[PDB]
């Protein structure tokens, strides 16, 4: 097989049709299903795989208690074909409390981060063997995209950050060839905080939309040049900003260059993508909690800082049902790159005190040129009934 290149144009998307759902938490109530969080989807040339950071335990288990902590020695990157729930036969790809993965066209690259908070190790595992590793450069929770990396002509790119979350962070973009780190670029341009980038191939470049945990409720864009490792960055101009928390749509605003400061602090991993000057994007329906999930196209919302003309709205999870992270992934169709996205559907602690564990289902949608209808595909588990 040749290295991936994504040279095909992006599909004429008119909205997202449903593609998959796991029911992991519904199955957990009578099954040995893994406790997870920070799930993501990535695909080899033949089929898609779901990944998640497993809390080193099944859900109906003593070890599922206090699984709300995001960093422990036991977290491992679970991998399955998409839709196969994470049952006990699931492969733990690597030790990891933060990670990213991507098939380069020849084999899987995983970036698996683990260790002490003050001194984490990132392990680059390519073709199923550890090829490289790099130590935390700012000694303050080395962390990565919690979603697919992107590879073009073999050079995978992964955005990694170190340093303070509610303050000025140090971010580097690692260029990886068959797991060997070939180059590293420090973040440049005007993005002031850059957590958890959802990347998508945008040949010849890779583009990523991230989480400003510090000052932006608008999302930062990182625009990465694979042929010369140059980085530039900016923000999602849409007046309908993608992060959570944010000001409501009546009062929110954005800037193409700066964090908009409006409810800037904290955030949620999300996504958006360009469609000429229009921007497709997905966000929680609520602006102060990760309840619901919606997607829409904002007319000129990629280029114009003042635009609030949404069109093609779709509820994916209604405003009563919890969501969580979400992330674009790209699927190479016959003659265009489709943009799919996933939504983590977090359940349990600390919002739902009815159970001792915290876990997630996922639901996955793909861009469609064809028509589509309506629905709501929440997690669906009844936490009043299942194991506390």
């Amino acid at each position: 097989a040749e290295y991936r290149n994504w040279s095909k144009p992006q599909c004429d998307i008119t909205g997202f049709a449903p593609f998959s759902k796991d029911n992991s938490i519904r199955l957990s109530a009578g099954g040995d299903i893994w406790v997870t969080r920070e799930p993501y989807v990535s695909c080899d040339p033949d089929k898609c795989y779901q990944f998640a950071l497993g809390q080193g335990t099944t859900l109906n288990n003593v070890h599922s208690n206090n699984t709300v902590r995001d960093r422990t020695p036991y977290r491992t990157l679970l991998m399955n074909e998409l839709g196969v729930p994470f049952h006990l036969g699931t492969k733990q790809v690597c030790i990891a409390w933060s990670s990213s993965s991507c098939h380069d066209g020849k084999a899987w690259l995983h970036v698996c981060i683990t260790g002490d908070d003050k001194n984490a190790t990132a392990s680059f595992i390519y073709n199923g063997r550890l090829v490289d590793s790099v130590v935390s450069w700012s000694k303050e929770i080395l962390r990565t995209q919690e979603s697919e990396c992107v590879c073009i002509n073999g050079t995978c790119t992964v955005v990694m950050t170190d340093g303070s979350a509610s303050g000025k962070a140090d971010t580097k973009i690692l260029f990886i060839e068959e797991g060997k780190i070939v180059h590293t670029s420090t973040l440049s341009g005007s993005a002031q905080h850059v957590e958890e980038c959802s990347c998508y191939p945008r040949y010849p470049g890779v583009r990523c939309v991230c989480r400003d945990n510090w000052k932006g409720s608008n999302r930062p864009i990182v625009d990465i040049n694979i042929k010369d490792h140059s980085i530039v960055s900016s923000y999602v101009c849409s007046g309908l900003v993608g992060d959570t928390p944010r000001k409501n749509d009546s009062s929110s605003s954005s800037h193409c260059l700066d964090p908009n400061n409006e409810e800037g602090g904290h955030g949620v991993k999300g996504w958006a993508f360009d469609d000429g000057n229009d921007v497709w994007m997905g966000r929680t329906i609520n602006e102060t909690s990760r309840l619901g999930y919606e997607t829409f196209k904002v007319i000129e919302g990629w280029s114009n800082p003042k635009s609030k003309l949404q069109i093609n709205r779709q509820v994916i999870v209604d405003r009563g049902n919890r969501s969580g992270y979400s992330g674009i992934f790209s699927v190479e169709g016959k003659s265009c790159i489709n943009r799919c996205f996933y939504v983590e559907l977090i359940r349990g602690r600390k919002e739902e005190t009815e159970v001792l564990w915290t876990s997630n289902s996922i639901v996955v949608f793909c861009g469609t040129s064809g028509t589509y209808g309506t629905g709501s595909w929440p997690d669906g588990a009844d936490l009043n009934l299942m194991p506390i």
Partner: antibody
Amino acid sequence: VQLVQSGAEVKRPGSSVRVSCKASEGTFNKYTLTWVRQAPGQGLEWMGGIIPISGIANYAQKFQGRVAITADESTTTAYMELSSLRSEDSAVYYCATAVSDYFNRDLGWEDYYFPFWGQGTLVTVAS
Amino acid sequence: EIVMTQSPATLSVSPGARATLFCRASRSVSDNLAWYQQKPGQAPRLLIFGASTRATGVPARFSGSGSGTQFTLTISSLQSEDFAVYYCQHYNIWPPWTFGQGTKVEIKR
């Protein structure tokens, strides 16, 4: 729990000041240690704190890039060095425990409230 | 940055009587809120956390209530010990952990 701080300070502008806080045995393994300011007529103002396993320190917007907070379990003392002092910084500085044990890189901090406070160090900044 | 606001600034109240101190947040802080007493010149003293749980050293006469954007500290019968400044403070999810400008509970006569 008990905390005791360095005596009062008088300092020249542009200089630094290094307030110390000796906490009781094992404190830095259980509670985030934090520094909270009180300007003479004003309200309380958190400067930052240090996480009680990793020793990672997090600072408030107004002080980030000029305060340093550090701690040593050999002496169970924590220190705040405040740089580029100006008369605005004339305030009482309290060290305080924060119940927050841990930081989720996604969900932020739980329980960041201050059950135990040092006696407070008066810092004055004048020419 | 969430902005805490307290009223009234100077809650003048007689001894033995009840006092109630109001605190507002510029957005919902859930129940992630605390109240600190402060005698003139002493370090602050935690009274309430989680908007209603009393702290370790706190007598029955102090009780906290409310959730979301509005909160109240109730002082059921003031002893001479209680005339102090009271600071509100959120601890909801993310920095900065802003305090209120504080309410002075004066002795009314």
